Specification:
Blueprint: E1 9-15, H1 23-36, E2 40-47, E3 49-50, E4 52-53, E5 59-61, E6 64-66, H2 68-82, E7 91-92, H3 93-105, E8 109-116, H4 121-130, E9 136-139, E10 142-148, H5 153-170, E11 176-180, H6 193-202, H7 212-229, E12 233-237, E13 257-260, H8 273-278, E14 283-285, E15 292-293, H9 306-315, E16 333-339, H10 349-362, H11 372-379, H12 390-404, H13 415-430
Parallel strand pairs: 1-2, 1-16, 2-8, 4-7, 8-11, 11-12, 12-13, 13-14, 14-16, 15-16
Antiparallel strand pairs: 2-3, 5-6, 9-10
Helix pairs in contact: 1-3, 1-10, 2-4, 5-7, 6-7, 9-10, 11-13, 12-13
Bound molecules: calcium ion (CA) (2 copies).
One calcium ion (CA) binds at residues 298-299, 307.
Amino acid sequence: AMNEKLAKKKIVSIDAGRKYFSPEQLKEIIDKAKHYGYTDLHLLVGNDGLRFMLDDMSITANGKTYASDDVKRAIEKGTNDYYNDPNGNHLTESQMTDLINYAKDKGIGLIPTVNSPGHMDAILNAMKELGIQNPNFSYFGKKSARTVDLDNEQAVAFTKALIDKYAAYFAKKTEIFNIGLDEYANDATDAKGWSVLQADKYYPNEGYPVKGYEKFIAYANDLARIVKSHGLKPMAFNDGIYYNSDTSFGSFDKDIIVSMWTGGWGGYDVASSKLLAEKGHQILNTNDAWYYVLGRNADGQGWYNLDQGLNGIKNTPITSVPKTEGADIPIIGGMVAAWADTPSARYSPSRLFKLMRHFANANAEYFAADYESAEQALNEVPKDLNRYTAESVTAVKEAEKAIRSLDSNLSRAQQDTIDQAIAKLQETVNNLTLTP
Ligand SMILES: [Ca+2]
Ligand SMILES: [Ca+2]
C-alpha cells in the first residue's frame, strides 16, 4: 500500500547565482530532470552573484524606500562586480514565471535560493551602491567580500526586506524557499566563520564578535518567519545550524528544512544529522559526495570534479546522509548539485546530464519511470482498424490495453516493463493485416 521510495523528492541543483543560465538552458535541464524521474529543480539565483530581477525591486527599509530602478541598477552592477558573465546578467520576472509554469506542466517543482548572510557578494555590492555604509563583515582587519555584518542594522534590514520581496513573488508558485545560511565569512576567516561567531562566549576579551552566533540564530529565525508568512517552507544548508553541536546559544526554527551537504572536516565540526533530526528538523540529503563544479571535468582537475562526483554517486546512495553518528536518519529526498565556483568555466550540458543520469541510475528504485514514449506510442496507433482482419485487430487492442494497464507509478528500475509493452504494441501494429 506504500510507495515510500518514489514518494521522496529527487532534486537537481543548479548554481545560477554565480553563473548565468538562460531560460532555454534551464528548460533543457527541466526536460532531462523529468526524463530521468526527478521531482524538482533547485535553482540558486542568489549565490555570490544575484541573477533574478523582479519587475518591482523597490525596497522599504531603514525608514525609507530604495527606488526600484536604483535597486535594479545596484544589483546588476554588484553582480557584474562579482562576475560579468558574457552570456547574461539575470533572469527577468517574466522569464521566471514562464520557467516555473513550464516545469509545473511537466510535474517538476522549482525551489529557489537567495543566499545570506554569506555568499551575498552582489547584495553587499548593491547595498554600497545604494549608499548603505559598511555592510561587510570584517575579522581582525580582513574584510569579507561575501558576508554581511549582523551588527549592521541597516544592512541586515535591507537584506531581510529583499528576501521578503523575493519570497512574496515565489508565494503560491513554489513550496520551498532556500535561505542558504552556509559558510559564514569563509573568505575572511579561512573557513573558521562559525567558530569565530561562537568564540566570544567562551574566549571573552579577545576581540571576537560579541553575541555573534546568537545574532546569527536570530537572523536565521527571522528569515524563517518571513518565508513562512508567505506559506513557503524555509530551507537552509546544515553547516551553521548548531555548529559544534552547540545548543547553548539559542534554538533554530524547527520549520527550517535542513539541506545536509557536509559532514564537516578537520577543525570544522558541524552538528550531526542525528542531532538535527532530534531537534525536530526534516532533512534533504544533499551529500557533497555527489557535487560537480563546472569545468572540473576529470580526475586531477580539483575538488568536486566530475569523475569524483560520479564516483560519489556510485559509492554513496541517496539514503546515505552526512555525519549520521551511526543513527538511522530519515530523509525527505536527495539532491545532486552542480556548482559554478569558477563561473567563467564552460557549461557543458552533456556532462551535467551524465551526472543527473548516474544519480538516477544508481538509485533507480527512487526515480520515476519514463512514460513519455509509451504515451507517444499510443498516439501513433492507427485510430480505425475496421479494414484489418479480426485476429490482427484483437492483437493490437490487447497490446494497447496492456500499456494502458501498466502501473502508473513505476520506478526507473522497472523501465524495461514499459519498454517491452511499447515494443509489443509496435509489433502488433506492424502485423496488422488487411482483410482479403
Ligand atoms: Ca564553499
Ligand atoms: Ca578520468
